Design an enzyme around this catalytic site. Structure first.
Site, mmCIF file in Angstrom:
data_model
loop_
_atom_site.group_PDB
_atom_site.id
_atom_site.type_symbol
_atom_site.label_atom_id
_atom_site.label_comp_id
_atom_site.label_asym_id
_atom_site.label_seq_id
_atom_site.Cartn_x
_atom_site.Cartn_y
_atom_site.Cartn_z
ATOM 1 N N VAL A 5 -1.012 -1.583 -4.455
ATOM 2 C CA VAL A 5 0.379 -1.976 -4.217
ATOM 3 C C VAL A 5 1.017 -0.970 -3.267
ATOM 4 O O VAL A 5 0.935 0.240 -3.491
ATOM 5 C CB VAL A 5 1.170 -2.078 -5.533
ATOM 6 N N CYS A 6 1.608 -1.469 -2.180
ATOM 7 C CA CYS A 6 2.330 -0.604 -1.248
ATOM 8 C C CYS A 6 3.795 -0.586 -1.691
ATOM 9 O O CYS A 6 4.574 -1.497 -1.395
ATOM 10 C CB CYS A 6 2.119 -1.045 0.203
ATOM 11 N N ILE A 7 4.153 0.407 -2.475
ATOM 12 C CA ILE A 7 5.540 0.638 -2.852
ATOM 13 C C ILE A 7 5.982 1.909 -2.171
ATOM 14 O O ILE A 7 5.180 2.832 -1.973
ATOM 15 C CB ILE A 7 5.748 0.733 -4.376
#
Ligand SMILES: CCNC(=O)C1(Cc2ccc(-c3cc(Cl)cc(Cl)c3)cc2)CCN(C(=O)COC)CC1
Lengths: 169, 75
Positions: A86-88
């Site tokens: 996940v690219c947070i």
């Protein structure tokens, strides 16, 4: 190392006061740097009934370096790579969306809830899903391609739940 | 008249005095009152769902002594 003690307190804190819809455990007991995260899709959502699984990787710098969040379940989402990563903003190494030593796992997990609620269409990891999400929102829900993929994956997690012996609440 | 709570990411709990029909857009007007954060950047979460503005507290069935969770999104 202070990271070990920080993770023990944070595991205990998140198991005594769980983030609603999240269940956190250790992949293997004795390793505090590797967490199993079991997320549950809430009612009145297209993820309702789901049983999604993910894992957290914490560095030895923790909390001075961000951990890594990786779904084991396949997810169709504009901000989730094909790997599951996940690219947070908060998980990116370097205001409340960027990583600091003040941030904790409860901050990360709540940020993931927000990101599942509202994708960040500005930095898409899955471009095809971001471009599919936007035609859903611009059609005001009419176009059902995105919600069909989501509901297919949500339906399949029932097999995952049975294998792990989990009663979906 | 009710009394709900709003937990934040730093840990503080913000008790606010609302009505069951208060729109979410007004609930965050009271949060700029107390914390100065612009309402366009606020995100309230209740039962894993981001409460959208243009809806009431009764649309999501938020009762007395409930806790919401504020997260911030520049956008
Ligand atoms: C395209 C999918 N979006 C959605 O389902 C909505 C957003 C949403 C909310 C929560 C989560 C979520 C929360 C947790 Cl804690 C865990 C997980 Cl796994 C997911 C995912 C998406 C927007 C569309 N909806 C509405 O308009 C209905 O209003 C009545 C249904 C809810």
């Amino acid at each position: 190392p202070s990271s070990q003690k920080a993770l023990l307190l944070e595991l205990k804190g998140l198991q005594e006061e769980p983030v609603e819809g999240f269940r956190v455990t250790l992949v293997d007991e004795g390793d505090l740097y590797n967490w199993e995260v079991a997320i549950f899709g809430p009612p009145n959502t297209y993820y309702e009934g789901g049983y999604f699984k993910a894992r957290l990787k914490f560095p030895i710098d923790y909390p001075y370096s961000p951990p890594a969040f990786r779904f084991l379940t396949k997810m169709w989402h504009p901000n989730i790579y094909e790997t599951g990563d996940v690219c947070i903003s908060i998980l990116h190494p370097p205001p409340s969306e960027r990583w600091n030593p003040t941030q904790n796992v409860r901050t990360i997990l709540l940020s993931v809830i927000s990101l599942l609620n509202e994708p960040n269409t500005f930095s898409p990891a899955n471009v095809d899903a971001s471009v599919m999400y936007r035609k859903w929102k611009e059609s005001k829900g009419k176009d059902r391609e995105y919600t069909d993929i989501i509901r297919k994956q949500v339906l399949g997690t029932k097999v995952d739940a049975e294998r792990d012996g989990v009663k979906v609440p | 008249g009710m009394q709900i709570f709003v937990k934040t990411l730093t840990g503080k709990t913000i008790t606010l005095e609302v009505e069951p029909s208060d729109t979410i857009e007004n609930v965050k007007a009271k949060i700029q009152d107390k914390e100065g954060i612009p309402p366009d950047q606020q995100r309230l979460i209740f039962a894993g769902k981001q409460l959208e503005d243009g809806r009431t507290l009764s649309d999501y069935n938020i009762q007395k002594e409930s806790t919401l969770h504020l997260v911030l999104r520049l956008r």
